[PDB]
Design an enzyme around this catalytic site. Structure first.
Site, short mmCIF file in Angstrom:
data_model
loop_
_atom_site.label_atom_id
_atom_site.label_comp_id
_atom_site.label_asym_id
_atom_site.label_seq_id
_atom_site.Cartn_x
_atom_site.Cartn_y
_atom_site.Cartn_z
N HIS A 1 4.39 0.10 -13.72
CA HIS A 1 4.08 0.59 -12.36
C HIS A 1 5.14 0.57 -11.17
O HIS A 1 5.79 -0.53 -11.29
CB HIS A 1 2.97 -0.61 -12.08
CG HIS A 1 1.78 -0.01 -11.05
ND1 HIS A 1 1.81 -0.11 -9.88
CD2 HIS A 1 0.46 0.45 -11.42
CE1 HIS A 1 0.68 0.19 -9.27
NE2 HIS A 1 0.06 0.70 -10.10
N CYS B 1 -6.10 1.29 -9.06
CA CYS B 1 -5.57 2.50 -9.62
C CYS B 1 -5.34 2.85 -11.05
O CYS B 1 -5.64 3.67 -11.70
CB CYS B 1 -4.09 2.64 -8.75
SG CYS B 1 -3.05 1.06 -8.70
N1 LIG Z 1 -0.92 1.35 -3.02
C1 LIG Z 1 -1.67 1.40 -4.19
O1 LIG Z 1 -0.90 1.89 -5.14
C2 LIG Z 1 -3.23 1.15 -4.45
C3 LIG Z 1 -3.78 1.79 -5.19
C4 LIG Z 1 -5.33 1.82 -5.19
C5 LIG Z 1 -5.91 0.52 -4.41
N2 LIG Z 1 -5.09 -0.08 -3.70
C6 LIG Z 1 -5.77 -1.02 -2.85
O2 LIG Z 1 -6.05 -0.63 -1.66
C7 LIG Z 1 -5.68 -1.70 -0.61
C8 LIG Z 1 -4.59 -1.07 0.38
O3 LIG Z 1 -3.26 -1.07 -0.32
P1 LIG Z 1 -2.16 -0.36 0.54
O4 LIG Z 1 -1.13 -0.32 -0.51
O5 LIG Z 1 -2.82 0.60 1.36
O6 LIG Z 1 -1.55 -1.55 1.42
P2 LIG Z 1 -0.95 -1.81 2.75
O7 LIG Z 1 -0.42 -3.09 2.89
O8 LIG Z 1 -0.12 -0.60 3.10
O9 LIG Z 1 -2.19 -1.41 3.50
C9 LIG Z 1 -2.99 -2.57 4.30
C10 LIG Z 1 -3.20 -2.17 5.78
O10 LIG Z 1 -4.33 -3.04 6.15
C11 LIG Z 1 -3.96 -3.50 7.72
N3 LIG Z 1 -4.63 -4.85 7.88
C12 LIG Z 1 -4.15 -5.85 7.57
N4 LIG Z 1 -5.41 -7.01 7.97
C13 LIG Z 1 -6.09 -6.18 8.49
C14 LIG Z 1 -7.35 -6.28 9.08
N5 LIG Z 1 -7.70 -7.57 9.12
N6 LIG Z 1 -7.92 -5.23 9.79
C15 LIG Z 1 -7.63 -4.11 9.84
N7 LIG Z 1 -6.39 -3.72 9.05
C16 LIG Z 1 -5.79 -4.75 8.54
C17 LIG Z 1 -2.37 -3.53 7.51
O11 LIG Z 1 -2.05 -3.48 8.82
C18 LIG Z 1 -2.14 -2.26 6.82
O12 LIG Z 1 -1.96 -1.16 7.37
C19 LIG Z 1 -5.63 -2.85 -1.42
O13 LIG Z 1 -6.82 -3.59 -1.71
C20 LIG Z 1 -5.08 -2.50 -2.61
O14 LIG Z 1 -4.94 -3.49 -3.57
C21 LIG Z 1 -3.54 -0.05 -3.55
#
Ligand SMILES: NC(=O)c1ccc[n+]([C@@H]2O[C@H](COP(=O)([O-])OP(=O)(O)OC[C@H]3O[C@@H](n4cnc5c(N)ncnc54)[C@H](O)[C@@H]3O)[C@@H](O)[C@H]2O)c1
Ligand SMILES: NC(=O)c1ccc[n+]([C@@H]2O[C@H](COP(=O)([O-])OP(=O)(O)OC[C@H]3O[C@@H](n4cnc5c(N)ncnc54)[C@H](O)[C@@H]3O)[C@@H](O)[C@H]2O)c1
Ligand SMILES: NC(=O)c1ccc[n+]([C@@H]2O[C@H](COP(=O)([O-])OP(=O)(O)OC[C@H]3O[C@@H](n4cnc5c(N)ncnc54)[C@H](O)[C@@H]3O)[C@@H](O)[C@H]2O)c1
Ligand SMILES: NC(=O)c1ccc[n+]([C@@H]2O[C@H](COP(=O)([O-])OP(=O)(O)OC[C@H]3O[C@@H](n4cnc5c(N)ncnc54)[C@H](O)[C@@H]3O)[C@@H](O)[C@H]2O)c1
Lengths: 331, 331, 331, 331
Positions: A176, A149
């Site tokens: 953040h 992000c």
């Molecule tokens: N939230 C942010 O601000 C942001 C911004 C950009 C990128 N990201 C990146 O995107 C990714 C997701 O983060 P997020 O905030 O959505 O997190 P989150 O914790 O909300 O989402 C992760 C999801 O993955 C699921 N999960 C865990 N293991 C799994 C598996 N083995 N197979 C299928 N589902 C599984 C969990 O159930 C959950 O719904 C991370 O790599 C994060 O670093 C996050």
């Protein structure tokens, strides 16, 4: 082909809502939970509120405005029914398959392209829409990272700076909102800082978003680095860049360069405002970086720019944008 | 014998701090992390702040005030060296070994008495100090349970109400700070109310705390129930009790009964105050329930009473009091 | 005649957004500040986000979507140009002219009616839309109170409990988001509780919302009372009513009553839901009360109902409904 | 002589607790409210908690551990009996008399020295303990300003950077807890960024704290500047200094310098740590500035340093210290 999503979390659902309104087709969703939970969370979001449409489900599907989406619960990418669903593009938002070794597994699931929504290890290419997206060659590029992000808020601003004024060195801090990698109350963590009560603290933590900007802007290789501070807000952030330029500038020139990028080449990606906005005003904004013009400062050639970004929604729109690009290019 | 602690979390660490200041000797702590992290979290607490004394550690023990304390990372209670360490009383605060079935494991390891700091299933006895502790029996009670935080706050009051006026029915709601079983940001959970962002939401949740009171005050069996609203504070909770009594009373009489108890028999468990205080004012109060006398209302025989309680510190003092009781009677 | 608003704060701006979207004509707005500020606060709201339209201003007017709204800054109501603007209906949302005698000043400005958006004192009539709106007599009612945000949530429910089951005694508690009558950090206040840091405490404060329901439902006179707990949330509340009814009932029975009222005579005022929602899901919802069906408990005749309400948006809609009523009936 | 305090708020009360624990006699306290309130406010603190002493009061005095302390509600400095109390050093902490021309009335009322706990306008002098207190001149300097929480945090660090390496230019941002000049919920304010709701927003704001550093370290005139970001935390801030030095350094050199200052000449003013702490860890810390050793970075001659500071406690301590010096230097 169709799009499939693995990891229906914060970025995952948001990307879905977006792909959904643009009219892109998501055929299968895989998380580690029952469809009842998948549909409740999609219907109610604490930040983006009620889903604008009808949500229902059954033991095998998610029903959104009548269209059907296979919702599974396979803990392993290898065994995810990609091909059988008609899914050529797999958005990979689990957060646990960022080493491209593990993301490769969707390919032998029958998937054609994996898009890791976070910084990857050993990926084919890191793309930041607006900066090096023309670098995409569908012949050799399959496992793509869309960066973090933060790197998406830095890159568009750094590009304007490097082209108009030239950058010599730079440091940055991002203040953040907390994310899901943090604790709600004091609890064991790999990082003794993130291990702390996310909502009653300012937590200094490390980041590589800066270093990683060098992936899309090679000229910064070795000359950009930074830090991050997590604060008690849910989504929404601000990047505080302090650049050492190659010539003397005044705030007005810097701002004028940013504004022109925002209305021309970086349109839709970089934005520019002169209003006296606060965090809540940028939540759900679709831009990667929103230059708050009135805060720019310049001490000759040491300038200081500020860009807000909704780490959920803005990123999410970037993932969506990339997916449409991988698609229009034959995938 | 010596006290061991399995589950070094929020309650685990406050009990330790309290036992450490009382003179009791803890001899082993088990959790799932390394000694660095353990030492760290003990030293710095976002709420109770700094541990008053020197903490250090090697790849084996933790040195609090020079006194080494074994520390391990064993996931199976069966494989824990309680005996090997001279551990008679195990304090089970991991919150995963609540069915006294699994809990029983610490006995094989060499322990004589296990104290579950949560509502247990299948326990020998359930004690709430000040109310039914005179009923603990060394020879027959081995797997005790000190109930939940909320249960501990209602009991003292309900006892007082019942003895002075008699209770016909009574419903209650507890406004409570969030806890580690909630989520930072919308994420899957079994309880869909608790899957939601904890710090930016009032979250209704179910609670057995009222029902469980009937286990120490049998008269209320099937005559008392309640709800819980989790709010965005990190420690401190208040109980709003609406009791239908056996005679018409005035708030003044109800207050007078509650005050008398606080000064007599319940001294040290039930507190009573007439000052216009607020949440932060009860943070770190060791009492089980504090009566906010100025909030008592009474419509005839229908009365409403409130009692603050620090769900981490107050409760942890109860656990220590019991550990110290279980010991004062030969383990 | 036209509408004028006196006190453009949290309620005034929301009522405006609403009057605006409903096509009512607001001719003059008065507060204690410049138009730049009125325009900015209107354009950017922290809770309801960007105003859906064009906002501009000048030394003399606020231009909202091309319409010119006279905007002034007069501290004394006798001195506001209601007559010069053609304002027949004034909305008194300053919070300082609740004693009708002071709010009378509006009529001496040319105004024909005043609608105090708060519990009044000395008013012609206090009206709670949906409960007793039929009593407004245009011929005799001129300073109308729309009662508190809380009363509006209790009355639609209590009305149903009284007609279907018959209420004998009730006590309620409202867990409320904080309002501008509080402090950010400890500061002097008339109320020693409200004097404390609003965002880091649970603050018990008194409320006359219960007794006030007795003005719209005379049968509760001397039979209903309550309390409030202010907690760390920006907007959105919930009422926890514990009633002693006249017949034995079952939760399902009580819900069925509520749900029916909700889909019939109380449509638009009362709402009933069965989904497992948290606070954020009821923000910007327009009802006065939203019955959270899954929370009902019943110990025979002692029942317990929970109704959510957004104290800003919901209440605002009611003010807009009353204004439209007042207008439909001839000024 | 005796100390008097005008404006018993966050800084006023913290200063009193401190001066009180030191043995300094406070003879009169003035504010705009009644004694009951001052006492309650002193006794119960949302952040530092209970006043560890007996507080009582009557219609004319407060009573802290038996000592009588005259207390008043005079709206104008000229009318304060500073003299009738034998008060020589007045602590002007109300926040509305920072203009020396106005703080000057304390002199007319009988005092000889006035310490403005904030950047002043027309002050005889601006002192930041540990940096330039050696310039206080008793015969000429009568209206002293003790600078801002922020300047006091930058200054010691800047002093050390300048003397060890030499500062070319430097900019900084302070991530700061909210304070009583901000709003709880959107309300008119002079600053439109500060009109916004404080507890759910990251509010960018202007600060002159970097420019006042030149007033004490004159070699920085025109080489220092910066921004402030208010965040939803109650007390505690961190400064992020991005300095361009006169030679290439490594993070170690820099910290080595800072450590040495803290253990040496700046002891009690500057602090240094290598622990991985977070905001709550510095609340109630008495140092003007705390270097987070592990957060330092250096790109050649561009460095970045972080220093925490409890803006109420660190500062009130600095205020106490200056009071102690003005007394020892002779009034
Ligand atoms: N939230 C942010 O601000 C942001 C911004 C950009 C990128 N990201 C990146 O995107 C990714 C997701 O983060 P997020 O905030 O959505 O997190 P989150 O914790 O909300 O989402 C992760 C999801 O993955 C699921 N999960 C865990 N293991 C799994 C598996 N083995 N197979 C299928 N589902 C599984 C969990 O159930 C959950 O719904 C991370 O790599 C994060 O670093 C996050
Ligand atoms: N938090 C409170 O308010 C509080 C108060 C009273 C009772 N309780 C009950 O007390 C318990 C402790 O909760 P807490 O809030 O201290 O929570 P927590 O999540 O802070 O504590 C859990 C700790 O135990 C560790 N743990 C988990 N599995 C382990 C294992 N398998 N073996 C050993 N250690 C392991 C975790 O890593 C963590 O260190 C729960 O049963 C809770 O419902 C909590
Ligand atoms: N906040 C809510 O939840 C809510 C809900 C229901 C009812 N109410 C009631 O409605 C009123 C408004 O509350 P709020 O939260 O909107 O208040 P607020 O503090 O947000 O706004 C009040 C506005 O009135 C302006 N003002 C003050 N004195 C004035 C004067 N003498 N003449 C003209 N303008 C003046 C202020 O500058 C301010 O902009 C209060 O009576 C409140 O009790 C509030
Ligand atoms: N709070 C901090 O973080 C901090 C840090 C350093 C300096 N300061 C500066 O200190 C001052 C006070 O800040 P605070 O945060 O203590 O603010 P505050 O608003 O809590 O304190 C104000 C006190 O001053 C009283 N007061 C106001 N006008 C008065 C008057 N006319 N006569 C007598 N008493 C009056 C108010 O009633 C209140 O008791 C401001 O100049 C502030 O910028 C504050």
């Amino acid at each position: 082909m169709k799009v499939g999503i693995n990891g229906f979390g914060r970025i995952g659902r948001q990307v879905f809502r977006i792909l959904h309104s643009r009219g892109v087709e998501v055929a299968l969703i895989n998380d580690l939970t029952d469809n009842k939970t998948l549909a409740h969370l999609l219907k109610y979001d604490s930040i983006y509120h009620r889903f604008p449409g009808e949500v229902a489900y059954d033991d095998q599907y998610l029903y959104v405005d009548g269209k059907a989406i296979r919702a599974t619960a396979v803990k392993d990418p290898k065994e995810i029914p990609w091909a059988e669903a008609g899914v050529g593009v797999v958005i990979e938002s689990t957060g646990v398959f960022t080493d491209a070794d593990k993301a490769k597994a969707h390919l032998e699931g029958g998937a054609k392209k994996v898009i890791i929504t976070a910084p990857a290890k050993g990926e084919d290419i890191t793309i930041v829409m607006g900066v090096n997206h023309e670098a995409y060659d569908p012949s050799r590029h399959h496992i793509i990272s869309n960066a973090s992000c933060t790197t998406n808020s830095l890159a568009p601003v750094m590009k304007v700076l490097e082209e108009a004024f030239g950058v010599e060195k730079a440091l940055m801090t991002t203040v953040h909102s907390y994310t899901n990698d943090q604790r709600l109350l004091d609890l064991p963590h790999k990082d003794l800082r993130r291990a702390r009560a996310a909502a009653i603290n300012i937590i200094p933590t490390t980041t590589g978003a800066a270093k990683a900007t060098a992936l899309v802007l090679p000229s910064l290789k070795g000359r950009f680095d930074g830090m991050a501070l997590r604060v008690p807000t849910a989504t929404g952030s601000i990047s505080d860049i302090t650049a050492l330029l190659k010539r003397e500038v005044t705030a007005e020139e810097v701002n004028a360069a940013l504004k022109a990028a925002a209305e021309g080449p970086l349109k839709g990606i970089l934005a520019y405002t002169e209003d006296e906005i606060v965090l809540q005003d940028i939540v759900m904004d679709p831009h990667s970086s929103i230059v708050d013009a009135k805060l720019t400062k310049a001490l000759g050639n040491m300038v200081k720019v500020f860009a807000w970004y909704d780490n959920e929604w803005g990123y999410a729109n970037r993932v969506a944008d990339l997916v449409e690009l991988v698609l229009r290019k034959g995938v």
